[PDB]
Write a protein that binds this DNA or RNA. Structure first.
Ligand SMILES: [Fe+3]
Ligand SMILES: [Zn+2]
Ligand SMILES: [Zn+2]
Lengths: 450, 249, 142, 249
DNA sequence: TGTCGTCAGGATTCCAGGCAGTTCG
DNA sequence: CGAACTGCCTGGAATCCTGACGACA
């Protein structure tokens, strides 16, 4: 097997590089935020052999209640916010209650909900022919934070109005930048398997140097100063027993070193962003601080290679760029009807209007309990990144830019046995100033036909 | 390979086997013409054991060819459990891979145990200055560690010019053990510069459980340097321990 | 055969190690038991089954509720962190007793995952730690 | 209020610590310029302990303002569990509600514990008729309460002009501890008229558990009156107990 | 229903207490 | 001649080790 350490091509001299000031500043850093004095200090008062799981997962929802509750307080629309335990004092007046969604019960009379807060639990009944019945029905059923306006009854809270953590439609626009800059969003590379679209990848690397086919690509590529990788750089180890006969590179150091030789072709003026994943030799539990210190030694050696956290909010030119991968899309298309993998953006709208990444538990990804919920989108996100479905779609929701990143491997038998058609060689060229999709690059000609 | 060695006393060596068994679980005492040594680490990565016992400690010392054998700490620990120091410890190994432990005391007890094939990787230890070497007794370490380990789990070692202190903090229970040269528990100080470091007292508990009362204990460590603690046996033998510092809070 | 057949694997495997002349090649015999431990720890990890003291057959939802609404007992969770830690040193000592490739990622990924989940900088890799020793080989070679 | 207390012989005081913490887990120290007293009550309302320590017991004893402090003896037991006798125990309090225990001697060990409030029922020591006074020892009390425990769960006190006997029987086994002047168990006695009462065993077994064997104990009781178990410390201090009588026998 | 956590009884060691061998007041 | 110095034997306090009881899915 090869090691990908031979592809060394210098950039084309005919391609003009623009020398300009490149600001860079990350906002969500797991080192200074959580693990500084909150993650190592959870309880410190227990037996000789105690657990730190009851408190982390206990406060994990309390932090979400404080953050999302603060978001509801920032919105000048929700009013009369009370606790569930305070509903016994109010006789008939309608109030707002904020709580978790335990389950969802469907009945001919209407929708019976089980809302539990840190103070109490009550059943929130809402009619079927309601205006907010669609939002409350299509919402995330296992875990969600909701608010209701209504009055309690004989033990069942008869709510009238629904409130979800949706982004505000009314938002202040961003000032126009003096210099134009673009960005590329890509993930699901999966280096290490025998079905990798190596051709589209090397033509893509050669395309990054300035070897463009059309004249329009020169103006955009000449101003690209940032590259972002979502995750899933390898095929994974330990998923299915028939993977050893498929992994072309069974050595993990050759995958990290191979990936390092494949990524070193990017010029130095382009800022690199490397985010960890769940298939690589790193922390498979979300959230993910970064890579390990054994296998990521050549990556740490490269100063240009920046190992960002997962998730990470990268603020560029005053823009909040939420970088994450998640698995909420599959939970939506598998749990909410009328949703499929062919339209992943539609599944991403539900995740956008909840300010969370992956609230559904039980899917094929471990969730690590933390005393502070970090997956809550506090500030107004300008970009929402996701994937794991290999279908790229463009959709803007309430001025928020929604797009996918695609993949770089051909369709496998595993992908064939689950009835999902991947879309490899999808390179979306987005704009940083306008925070919208600028161009779409499709190298599907070099890949397999879907 | 066959060799025989007669060491007088059984309890003094049983303290070494007790300290080793409480600090390591699998070790293979390597036998050289200079004496019995063992450079190994606990399989849980907590301490680092280095036993150096010259032939001067042993009464009779007869070697044919230097070789290495493996000894279980548990079984050999149970042998010298009730072994009186007034006996005569005898180690004999012949052609076969058996160990003969003859006791010539109030009752001759010729013993036999198999010797397993330990695959211990002989690893050495590098050399570098620590700038903090102290000479303290053993009992002061006993009462100083067994009392602070109940209020906290990590202890902080700080040594200055003619000053020694070991303070440990916690939620609502602080402690410190300050000693100087004019005290009665600190023998000597070779501190040259300011030294401060943090370690885990939970390792120091079992690490010092096997120490004596009048045994001179020498500690060598640094700021970011690991912890070293060595002490002599019958004024000639040397037992050195080295543990990595705590990278946590 | 957790008693006789397990020791039989521990002795026959060592006989095979003596037979291959310290030349170990990657295999799936114990890995045949290590894969269910990996998918069981990762699977039950995100489950976190809450069972109160009084009620046993009454399981609580994966979200946190604070206390059991039915019974006045604390809720006990099963993230599979303390039950699988017993079978890990069984094969971990054997895997640690040899330097082999293509398997270090599976051995160290789970224990480092437990470390990252729960949370002693070792002076050096003397516990047979292929991490520092190996990366040092590659770094010094570059 | 800041104050300085210096007491020698922490080993003798540890028995008082075990005796005092064996019943109640927390203690309320009345810190007075004339001395340190302590009135703590058992939660089951069975015994009242009062420690009286004058100023003359403490060599170095500085009082700024008398007050009441709260000591969690559950950890103070661990403080004085390893305390020696030839050392010097020091209890100093500063401005904050913390207690700093300077332990000087062969090694310097200072402690820092919080001072929390102690909830105890206000029960004084009324001037009650005590017509039975006997002087016992620790071994006499240990053997008496333990041997009386192996036979029953209660005890019957019968004291006459020149005798002090304890008869107790559950159903079959009978115990009768007689004290005379020919032996050494009974040194002094003050019983004017014959007196009888009844008390428990488990509580007396819990109070004698901290008290040693060579410790003379003064016992007082009257006809169906509460028991007053007091004894001097260094011939100046006085520890007084209060037991509740039992209706059974 | 097996297995893990925890408490009381027995065994162990150093120090106090008590007992041999010798010499000068 | 007889107790102190020196050295040594034994019980008591602190410590360590082990068996039995109560709880959980
Ligand atoms: Fe992918
Ligand atoms: Zn993915
Ligand atoms: Zn319950």
């Amino acid at each position: 097997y090869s090691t990908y350490s031979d592809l060394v091509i210098a950039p084309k001299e005919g391609f003009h590089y623009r020398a300009k000031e490149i600001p860079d500043e990350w906002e969500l850093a797991f080192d200074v935020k959580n693990v500084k004095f909150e993650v190592p200090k959870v309880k410190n008062a227990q037996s000789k052999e105690g657990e730190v799981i009851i408190q982390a997962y206990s406060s994990y929802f309390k932090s979400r209640l404080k953050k999302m509750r603060r978001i509801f307080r920032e919105n000048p629309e929700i009013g009369t916010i009370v606790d569930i335990a305070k509903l016994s004092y109010v006789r008939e007046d309608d109030v707002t209650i904020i709580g978790l969604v335990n389950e969802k019960r469907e009945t001919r009379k209407g929708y019976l909900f089980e809302i539990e807060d840190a103070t109490g639990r009550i059943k929130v009944f809402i009619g079927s022919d309601k205006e907010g019945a669609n939002e409350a029905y299509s919402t995330i059923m296992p875990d969600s934070v909701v608010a209701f306006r209504g009055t309690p009854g004989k033990g069942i809270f008869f709510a009238n109005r629904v409130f979800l953590p949706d982004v505000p439609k009314f938002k202040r626009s961003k000032p126009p930048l003096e210099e134009k800059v673009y960005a590329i969003l890509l993930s699901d590379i999966h280096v290490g398997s025998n079905k990798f679209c190596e051709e589209a990848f090397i033509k893509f690397l050669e395309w990054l140097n300035g070897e463009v086919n059309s004249r329009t690509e020169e103006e955009l590529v000449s101003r690209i100063k940032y590259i972002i990788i979502g995750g899933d750089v390898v095929d994974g180890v330990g998923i299915y027993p028939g993977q050893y006969n498929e992994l072309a590179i069974p050595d993990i150091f050759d995958q990290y070193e191979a990936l390092a030789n494949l990524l070193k072709q990017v010029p130095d003026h382009i800022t690199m962003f490397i985010g960890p994943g769940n298939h690589d030799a790193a922390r498979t539990a979300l959230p993910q601080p970064g890579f390990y210190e054994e296998y990521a030694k050549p990556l740490y050696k490269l100063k240009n290679a920046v190992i960002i956290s997962n998730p990470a909010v990268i603020r560029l030119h005053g823009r909040d760029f939420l970088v994450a991968h998640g698995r909420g899309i599959e939970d939506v298309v598998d749990f909410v009807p009328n949703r499929s993998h062919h339209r992943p953006a539609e599944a991403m709208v539900e995740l956008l209007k909840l300010r969370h990444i992956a609230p559904t538990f039980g899917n094929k990804v471990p969730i690590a309990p933390d005393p502070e919920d970090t997956l809550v989108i506090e500030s107004v996100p300008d970009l929402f990144q996701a994937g794991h479905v290999h279908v790229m779609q463009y959709k803007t929701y309430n001025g928020v830019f929604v797009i996918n990143t695609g993949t770089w491997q051909a369709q496998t038998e595993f992908q064939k046995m689950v009835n999902i058609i991947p879309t490899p060689a999808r390179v979306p060229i987005i704009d940083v100033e306008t925070a919208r999709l600028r161009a779409v690059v499709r190298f599907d000609q070099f890949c397999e036909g879907v | 390979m066959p060799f025989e060695v007669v060491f007088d006393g059984a309890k003094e060596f049983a303290d070494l086997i007790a300290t080793a068994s409480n600090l390591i679980d699998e070790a293979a005492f390597k036998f050289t013409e200079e004496g019995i040594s063992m450079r190994a680490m606990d399989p849980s990565r907590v301490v680092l054991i280095d036993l150096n016992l010259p032939e001067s400690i042993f009464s009779k010392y007869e070697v044919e060819e230097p070789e290495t054998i493996g000894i279980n700490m548990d079984q050999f620990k149970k042998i010298l459990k009730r072994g009186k120091a007034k006996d005569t410890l005898i180690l004999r190994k012949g052609d076969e891979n058996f160990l003969e432990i003859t006791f010539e005391g109030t009752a001759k007890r010729t013993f036999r145990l198999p010797l397993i094939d330990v695959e211990e990787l002989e690893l050495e230890l590098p050399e570098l200055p620590f700038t903090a070497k102290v000479v303290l007794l053993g009992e002061v370490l006993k009462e100083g560690i067994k009392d602070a380990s109940l209020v906290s789990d990590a202890i902080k070692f700080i040594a200055k010019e003619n000053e020694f202190t070991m303070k440990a903090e916690g939620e609502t229970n602080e402690v410190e053990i300050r000693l100087t040269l004019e005290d009665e528990g600190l023998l000597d100080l070779e501190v040259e510069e300011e030294t401060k470091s943090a370690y885990g007292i939970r390792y120091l508990s079992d690490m010092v459980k096997g120490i004596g009362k009048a045994d001179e204990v020498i500690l060598r460590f640094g700021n970011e340097m690991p912890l070293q603690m060595e002490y002599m046996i019958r004024d000639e033998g040397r037992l050195t321990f080295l543990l990595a510092p705590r990278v946590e809070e | 055969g957790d008693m006789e057949e397990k020791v039989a694997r521990q002795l026959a495997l060592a006989e095979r190690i003596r037979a291959v002349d310290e030349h170990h090649v990657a295999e799936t015999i114990i890995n045949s038991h290590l894969v269910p431990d990996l998918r069981g720890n990762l699977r039950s990890f995100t489950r976190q089954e809450f069972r109160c003291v009084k009620c046993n057959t009454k399981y609580r939802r994966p979200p946190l509720t604070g206390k059991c609404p039915k019974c006045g007992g604390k809720i006990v969770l099963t993230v599979s962190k303390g039950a699988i830690e017993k079978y890990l040193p069984t094969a971990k000592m054997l895997v640690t007793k040899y330097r082999v490739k293509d398997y270090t990622r599976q051995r160290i990924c789970i224990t480092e995952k437990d470390i990252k989940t729960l949370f002693q900088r070792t002076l050096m890799g003397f516990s047979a730690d292929i991490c520092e020793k190996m990366v040092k080989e590659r770094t010094g070679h570059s």
